[PDB]
Amino acid sequence: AYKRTFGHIPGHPEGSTYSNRRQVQKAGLHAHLQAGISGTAKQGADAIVLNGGYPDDRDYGDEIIYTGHGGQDPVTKKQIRDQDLDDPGNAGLVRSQLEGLPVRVIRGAGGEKPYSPSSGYRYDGLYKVVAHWFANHEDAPQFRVCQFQLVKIYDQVAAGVVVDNPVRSAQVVKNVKGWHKHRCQVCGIVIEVDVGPYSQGAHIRPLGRKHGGPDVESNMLCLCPNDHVRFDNGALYITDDLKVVNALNGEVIGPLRVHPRHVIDLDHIRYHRSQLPNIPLEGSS
Amino acid sequence: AYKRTFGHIPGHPEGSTYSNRRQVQKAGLHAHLQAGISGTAKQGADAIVLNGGYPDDRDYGDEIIYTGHGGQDPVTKKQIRDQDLDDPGNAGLVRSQLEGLPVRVIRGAGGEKPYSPSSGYRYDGLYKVVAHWFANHEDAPQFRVCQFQLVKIYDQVAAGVVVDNPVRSAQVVKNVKGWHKHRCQVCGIVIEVDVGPYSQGAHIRPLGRKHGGPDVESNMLCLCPNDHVRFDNGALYITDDLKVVNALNGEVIGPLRVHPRHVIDLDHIRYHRSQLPNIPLEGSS
Ligand code: NA
Ligand code: NA
Ligand SMILES: [Zn+2]
Ligand SMILES: [Zn+2]
């Protein structure tokens, strides 16, 4: 059974070569035998195979314009209808872009000349999905195709990505957002984009050398992009009794939206509160 | 006259050494003779000098915990009051973090041992300011100091920075946000953080190889973080008559907030609209 997994695969480093698609499938690199995109709307896309599937595709080594799946005649191999984001591979690729999930590019024999191998399939490491759009198909302008921009991840801490087995844990984010359904714990909204709901996982006690916060569900809030910014730059704090308070003027906003399977560790809350200029004293709210 | 300028300075590459602070000042690297931070709340901070100014400072080469300016007795050289964000250097450093402006680190003789030079002052290239907080001073815990986390920029397109002379133009962003006063052109709000107002500059026709958008004031909108996300992932478009429309359901939101010195080039609007799955036809709104 294939297990969908983001990041490098144990045993198969960047550079690894394979003879055909069944190899790649057995190794755990892709899910599929023919299909270009390994992915699902719910979970994200963990790999793509690039073997000149459309003539819209462009390959610049470190940059890739990848064209999506859908709307081909099985017999003709010619576009007969528009591409959409119901396609799990197309949807999964957008969901990778939004969650910042890295995508294993596996490059194939038949593709663009300088970067493709002469024969077989090489695994060329992880790329980040940056944007997506629709354009007109080159061979048949009356039909729309979906397209993605992919950029090579050179340093994993630099580009902000999340991976399954470590860098920051993908699982942690996915739990917290899943429990809340991408609703901001402060203002209640869900940001709706083309593919679906959108939110940001925001650590309460920051990660790294100085602060040493754990990367876990208890040290994280699901927030909208606006509230993330406020929260990280002294405009919100949370009380011991889980009220959200405007740090700039002292005014109490309202209660934090809680979920029973999501246990916020109050030590981390206290720590975050303690990064403000004047620590809120007893009786402040 | 010193001109405050973000990024590398012509003639002084990373590695450049100098004998004392007056040299650094003449070269154009810093603004000041003693003061650690070159910077202002309005414009941002373009440099810091790191010469063991506080014992709270930590130096890890690629990471730096820098401690801010303020609250010292001129005679004693000991902390006598709390640090605040009225200090132009402290404020400027937060404003650098928010605008994503790179900061020239110049490292000094008296600092942390492995990374400091043996004598003089070396220019160690650009760093990005990532976060800031307040903590207790080591020598006098009853007083608060301001602190910053700085990370070395290795690739300038990767870390998302904006520089004065080119990468993306800092001037372009600064104009657009200045004309609008960090108000979202879609929803009207200003995000207020500790140091002041906050917004995002959002190109209308994206930059780079595929789309080839210009990096100019006419191809950019000032937006709140929430609306930026919607705008880049098929949830908003703008009409020829400058109304904002919800791309998901077709519903018209309201008119775009315009400013007379900010001329949006309608070709770019049309281009952005044309990235949606079905291009809006005549009579759509
Ligand atoms: Na954060
Ligand atoms: Na953008
Ligand atoms: Zn919110
Ligand atoms: Zn807005």
Numbering used by the authors:
A (entry chain A), B (entry chain A): 2 to 167, 193 to 311
What does the paper say about this structure?
TagI belongs to the recently characterized SRA-HNH family of modification-dependent restriction endonucleases (REases) that also includes ScoA3IV (Sco5333) and TbiR51I (Tbis1). The SRA-HNH REases are characterized by the presence of an SRA (SET and RING finger associated) domain at the N-terminus and an HNH (histidine-asparagine-histidine) domain at the C-terminus. Our data show that TagI is a member of the NTP-independent dimeric REases that cleave DNA at a distance from the modified cytosine base. We attribute the modification specificity to the SRA domains, and the RYN/RY specificity to the HNH-domain dimer.
